[PDB]
Design a protein around this ligand. Structure first.
Ligand SMILES: Nc1ncnc2c1ncn2[C@@H]1O[C@H](COP(=O)(O)OP(=O)(O)OP(=O)(O)O)[C@@H](O)[C@H]1O
Lengths: 282, 49
């Protein structure tokens, strides 16, 4: 059982498990609560491993069912166990990623049933983040399956984070990398300021951070409509000089070939293409 | 008495009449090596103790 901070390198354990299974000529099953992550992990594993066949089993697709490495959803595994598939006899490792996202009601019963129904020759690898309820999951699994499981945790984040506040064309650091609040900086922030964004607000930020070599930016707006307005407010700003635009255009043109000819003229596609040529997206 | 002294050839598996000893030896040598199942079962021992 591994419970480490985010961006600490949890995927190294899964890669080593897959390599061990390939060396022993056994099978591995990878499972995630969310179907969105399955495709991304499938692509990542296909790129990373060249001597190992990778498969995918979801409610929409089914690629290489006979491969030695399979990525599927929890309900797919539940149905497979209920049917009594013959490939389970060769499975050595089952990996559950993002365990801390399974504390829901619909996601909870299927996970417990899958854990209960698994045979005794299968070993477990568990990955998640730091959550208050960590020892209980491991204890329950080790009691139900009567197996030895080790709980491994990390002290702190390998990369540190800081919290700042922006006000009137400069940035005030108020929490440092040690998670210690700075009262004087907050007081100065209160003093210097003595509603919503304006039309000349996002340009005032896309230039200050650009000159500081901190360009890669993700802005969180809690509204579908406000994001489009904010993106449209950024006018006369570009990040592709002459070849990045051509490469992006080629990638977009090749990608949307799978659609029909009259389905590529939709306004959303045109607006996204126009925005993507300058390095801005929603 | 002819049958008694000619067993193991009259009632055996098929081997061609004019088979050179070299080909016979090569055929015998192949079957004295692990089968495809043997190799896979050898490696799976470390996984399932
Ligand atoms: N010991 C290490 N030293 C240097 N780099 C490492 C080390 N371990 C992992 N990395 C790098 O971390 C990068 C990404 O880390 P990773 O994706 O595993 O974080 P994560 O914990 O899985 O995030 P999440 O919470 O979303 O699951 C990898 O590209 C890897 O090169």
């Amino acid at each position: 059982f591994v419970a480490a901070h985010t961006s600490a390198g949890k995927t190294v354990v899964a890669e080593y498990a897959i390599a061990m299974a390939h060396r022993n000529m056994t099978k591995t099953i990878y499972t995630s609560p969310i179907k969105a992550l399955s495709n991304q992990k499938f692509r990542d594993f296909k790129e990373t491993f060249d001597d190992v066949n990778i498969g995918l089993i979801t409610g929409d697709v089914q690629i290489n069912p006979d491969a030695n490495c399979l990525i599927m959803t929890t309900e797919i595994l539940r149905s497979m166990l209920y049917r009594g598939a013959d490939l389970i006899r060769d499975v050595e490792f089952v990996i559950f990623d993002q365990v801390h996202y399974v504390n829901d009601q619909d996601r909870g019963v299927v996970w417990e049933e899958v854990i209960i129904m698994l045979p005794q020759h299968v070993k477990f690898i568990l990955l998640s983040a730091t959550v208050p309820n960590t020892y209980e999951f491991a204890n329950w699994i080790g009691r139900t399956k009567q197996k030895n499981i080790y709980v491994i945790s990390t002290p702190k984040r390998p990369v540190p984070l800081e919290i700042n506040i922006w006000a009137k064309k400069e940035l005030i650091p108020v929490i440092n990398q040690n998670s210690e609040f700075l009262e004087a900086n907050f007081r100065k922030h209160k003093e210097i300021l003595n509603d919503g964004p304006s039309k000349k607000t996002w340009p005032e930020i896309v230039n200050y951070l650009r000159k500081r070599e901190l360009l890669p930016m993700v802005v969180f707006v809690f509204s579908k409509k406000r994001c489009e307005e904010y993106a449209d407010w950024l006018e006369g700003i570009n990040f592709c000089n002459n070849k990045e635009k051509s490469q992006i255009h080629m990638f977009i043109e090749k990608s949307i070939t799978r659609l029909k000819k009259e389905d590529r003229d939709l306004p959303q596609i045109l607006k996204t293409r126009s925005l993507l040529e300058r390095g801005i997206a929603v | 008495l002819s049958l008694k002294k000619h067993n193991n050839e009259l009632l055996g598996i098929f081997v061609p009449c004019n088979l050179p000893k070299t080909t016979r030896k090569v055929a015998i040598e192949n079957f004295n090596r692990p089968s495809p199942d043997d190799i896979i079962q050898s490696a799976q021992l470390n996984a399932f103790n």
